[PDB]
């Protein structure tokens, strides 16, 4: 004995024990990236080749 | 064998409908309605072969075979 079964309706599982087809089609992708930078440089210079007489004491 | 083509002109696929009467007994006779499915032209002077008649419970209740009458 079986229950009511429709004619035009598609084959779907309706109770406990019916079968279904599962197509495993998984595709997961993820990524991340980061960066940072810093820089500093300095240079100072002073010279005095020939010193005059009036600045010689200084 | 499979694969070989078959072109037919005298065969038509049909659906058969019938009404189950109350308090029906085995051996009694009922009338049926024969309707063509597909792309057939006419059912003039045709003959219906054996056909199981099932309800919504997918169990047989009647067997149908006879000659189709078309008014024409």
B37 has a chain A CB within 8 A of its CB: no
Residue B54 near residue B60 (C-beta atoms within 8 A): yes
Burial of B35 (0-12, 13-18, 19+ CB in 10 A): exposed
Contacts of A3 in chain B (CB under 8 A): 57
Whole-angstrom CA distances from B69 to B29, B44, B72 are 17, 7, 9
List the resolution, Å.
Answer: 3.5
Alpha helix segments (H runs only) across B25-68: none
Residue A17: left if φ>0, alpha if ψ -120 to 50, beta else—which one? left
């Amino acid at each position: 004995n079986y229950g009511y079964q429709p004619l035009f309706e598609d084959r779907r599982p309706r109770n406990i024990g019916d079968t279904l087809t599962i197509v495993l089609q998984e595709n997961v992708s993820a990524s991340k990236s980061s960066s940072a930078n810093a820089s500093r440089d300095g240079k100072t210079s002073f010279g005095f080749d020939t010193v005059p007489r009036y600045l010689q004491g200084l | 064998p499979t694969g070989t083509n078959m072109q037919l002109k005298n065969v038509a696929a049909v659906m058969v409908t019938a009404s189950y009467p109350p308090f029906a007994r085995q051996g009694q006779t009922i009338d049926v309605v024969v309707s063509s499915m597909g792309n057939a032209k006419s059912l003039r002077g045709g003959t219906l072969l054996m056909t199981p008649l099932k309800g919504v419970d997918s169990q047989v209740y009647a067997l149908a075979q006879g000659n189709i009458l078309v008014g024409g």
